Amino acid sequence: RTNENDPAKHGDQHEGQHYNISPQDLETVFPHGLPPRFVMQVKTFSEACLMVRKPALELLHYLKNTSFAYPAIRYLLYGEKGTGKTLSLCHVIHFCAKQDWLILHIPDAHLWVKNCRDLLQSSYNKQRFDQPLEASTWLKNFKTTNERFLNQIKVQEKYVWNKRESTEKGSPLGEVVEQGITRVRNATDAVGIVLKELKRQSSLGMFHLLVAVDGINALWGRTTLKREDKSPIAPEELALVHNLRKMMKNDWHGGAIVSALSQTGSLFKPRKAYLPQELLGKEGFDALDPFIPILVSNYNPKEFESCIQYYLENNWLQHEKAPTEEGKKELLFLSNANPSLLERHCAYL
Amino acid sequence: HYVDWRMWRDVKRRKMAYEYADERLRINSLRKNTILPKILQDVADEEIAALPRDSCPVRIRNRCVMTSRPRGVKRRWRLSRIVFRHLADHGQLSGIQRATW
Amino acid sequence: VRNPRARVVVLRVKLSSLNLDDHAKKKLIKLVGERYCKTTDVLTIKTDRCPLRRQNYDYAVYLLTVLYHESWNTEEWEKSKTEADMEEYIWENSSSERNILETLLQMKAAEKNMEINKEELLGTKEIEEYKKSVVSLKNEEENENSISQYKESVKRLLNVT
Amino acid sequence: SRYSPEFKDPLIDKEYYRKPVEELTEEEKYVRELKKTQLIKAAPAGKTSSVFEDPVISKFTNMMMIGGNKVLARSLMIQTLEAVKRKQFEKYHAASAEEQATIERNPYTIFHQALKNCEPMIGLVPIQVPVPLPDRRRRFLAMKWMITECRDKKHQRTLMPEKLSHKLLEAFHNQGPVIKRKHDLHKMAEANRALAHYRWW
Amino acid sequence: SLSEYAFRMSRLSARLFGEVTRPTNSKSMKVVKLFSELPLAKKKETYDWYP
Amino acid sequence: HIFLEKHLESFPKQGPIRHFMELVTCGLSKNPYLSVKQKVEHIEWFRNYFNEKKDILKESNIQFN
RNA sequence: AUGAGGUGGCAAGAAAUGGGCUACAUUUUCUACCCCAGAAAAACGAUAGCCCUUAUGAAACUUAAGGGUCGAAGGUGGAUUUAGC
């Protein structure tokens, strides 16, 4: 594994080499958004080693060479199912967190467009619907992630939560975050206000802002939610989706936008869809256009060997014949170097 | 000299239906639409009812042409299963053969 | 000797074999619908309406004649073409063009060297490459080959390498 | 069976073929020569030459299968193995250095030892009479007892991977309703001991 | 739903091919098939069933 | 065989009767079995029926002729 | 007329019984996909009941399909018994 655990200093020489993430960093940075299987692996091994891969290295280099004066650049982690797109986004997130950016991290947009039972028409705007449970759940993890930067932000308007309760210009954004977290009915409006304030303050220069959205295609893919009349609800009618589209719009600077495509959890998209237009539809492609796609593919031989060595070091591959080169080749064939399939295979060996 | 009175009745029904099909089609076209006035559709309904009973196509029964069997009649040959089996087994129907697969 | 299936006629013609411009070809394609196979660029008209073979053949020829003449003819409502009404994507006056224009304007505003113009910005070879890549993605086969070109063009335009 | 009786079952074992000619006996040489003239049934889609092929686990998966849902049966088996391994790793880490020596972590070893502990020695057959059990019947009874115990309704809303992993660990430690059932069979056999003479074989 | 361009093009195509031009419901569309097909009785299989 | 609407000279150029006769003519034109004389006979029958029922048409406010 | 024709009419369930279907769920249910996902989970469970619409038909409470409404019985079932190499 790498002796260089710094997210910013590790470079091409560390390709296919591991990279540790301390439990304190995990608690402070990833209350959400880690793949469930990787979370389970972390809990099992008491470690959070991520392999330094070429896509993550390239995206890190782009972010380092960015110029905050220009409007926020949109990068799109892209590729096949279970190739490490989400973990590459997590790597970039950890890098920026250690670089002291405000990380507006959406762990999975797909969760916001299905299964919601608390869906209600938004009081602030009857045209749109609110998702109080999801809003509060995201807000809690967002506060946990970026509490230190939260106090510094000065809100620029007066936001009324009722005819009697409001938050005033010059107040910390922590006030709005706490209001949304506590008063569940106002969580969606709090999330919208937070997105607005972060987007504008990044341009003002108050702080560097990294928007990091997984499953970005959900912002334009059809939703499975229904009205009271059993009628389908378009994605924009959700307040969270509307505000996140506004955030994705590149009409701001002082930050960068990184989105990761994900067929998993997507609605009305075939399994073998991994191209950007195919996953995003034409609407989403034009919305995110222009953007820089970053491909993530199956492990190269060195990455495969490094991952196998990590598993052997942890003794995860308890199978007697797993260490043998025959077992190594069997795993390589069965997973075809796909990290997700290889992890699932090694899960029961 | 049809096989039985039932076959004779079915023949009468087929003749009557062929005779009145055009009139039935015309009158039923008015009823089976949502354009013309409901009063016109109702008068058309009473007229189609007024047409003779045997003219109704639903009253045509597909009986075997050789034994007047009211059921088990293969449409392609218009023969009850018994008569069709007789002829096919004796080999008097082209192509048909005992199936084995 | 009668057989109802004998009255069916099929007229096949390659649209490219006719004297048709782009507009007339597209209008004819949209008028005829699934009767035209794009893979072979073949319009096939099946006539079974008339009782007789000669009648069906003459009707098929008449259908071809009227379709051709009306495709060449242009209707007033044609002007009201929704951007999605086109079988092909046109970069000009497109969301991609608007977005890249606004992005370049914002970039130069941030640079504070606002000595630019829309046509000046969009005439650069970089914009030509970006337009080519966008058209490739929207109209040609989507693949890693096209995605690489799009990525390179967008990188050069955004000034990140 | 579409196979004629002449067809012989396939032998999938790389070592058997890589064995040098010198080590072969005359009987083995004759068998190898004969097999060159015999027809061989197409290898079933179940078993392969993968070093990670465990026939015991494959048979357990087949037994757990319902209505030909082999994919779901395999998924349940792999989930159970993963759960067993994860529980073992958690116990290993939570345990002291001494107990870490004792704490096993190989799910295959755990599964095999659990089924072996659940194998019953003496059965009962109507003739009821205590009787010896052949090895195949012992193994099948162990597997079926495990699967039935996991399928018992007494467990509410708990998923099969978790249920089976818990029962497998209990059996590996010589506890649980499966071992209780084996003990009950042994006790009934002891109680009917006196009737052992009724058996004519 | 459909762009007016597509709507007008479809109606013009219907006019060209002799199809129904005016909008119509499924119930009333039955007349088109009723008059396109022969009546069940008028079919030879139906009225000449018996020799 | 196809352009049968030229026979609908007597019927109103608009209204429920015109729409229904448009449907009937489309069906007859699509019909490949009936002869031209039989199609014209169907149209004539509808004409006669509506002429006979003109009283109901006037009562229902559907202009005829 | 024990023949022929026409109009109209039964066909329900005190009760039992054979077969089949649907279930009693977590190896389940809903959704996406059609097999690397997210939710449900005291809900599961009617193809049953009632109302409406539509298909066919001259005629639909009679038939079928759909929609709405309802969320019922039941919680793997005794002896015994069926089929399967």
Ligand SMILES: Nc1ncnc2c1ncn2[C@@H]1O[C@H](COP(=O)(O)OP(=O)(O)OP(=O)(O)O)[C@@H](O)[C@H]1O
């Ligand atoms: N760079 C990496 N370092 C470590 N593990 C990785 C890496 N990339 C993938 N993995 C492994 O694969 C899984 C992560 O894959 P990930 O969740 O990113 O999939 P994805 O392909 O981006 O998209 P999806 O699976 O949602 O289609 C984990 O099990 C992890 O162990």
Ligand SMILES: Nc1nc2c(ncn2[C@@H]2O[C@H](COP(=O)(O)OP(=O)(O)O)[C@@H](O)[C@H]2O)c(=O)[nH]1
């Ligand atoms: N309740 C409430 N929500 C607000 C307020 N200001 C902003 N928001 C949130 O942000 C949204 C308004 O965003 P804005 O940029 O004004 O544009 P809009 O969404 O098109 O109106 C609202 O729908 C809320 O989600 C406010 O004063 N009260």
Ligand SMILES: [K+]
């Ligand atoms: K039963």
Ligand SMILES: [Mg+2]
């Ligand atoms: Mg992923």
Ligand SMILES: [Mg+2]
């Ligand atoms: Mg009948």
Ligand SMILES: [Mg+2]
């Ligand atoms: Mg009598």
Ligand SMILES: [Mg+2]
């Ligand atoms: Mg029902």
Ligand SMILES: [Mg+2]
């Ligand atoms: Mg009706």
Ligand SMILES: [Mg+2]
């Ligand atoms: Mg229910």
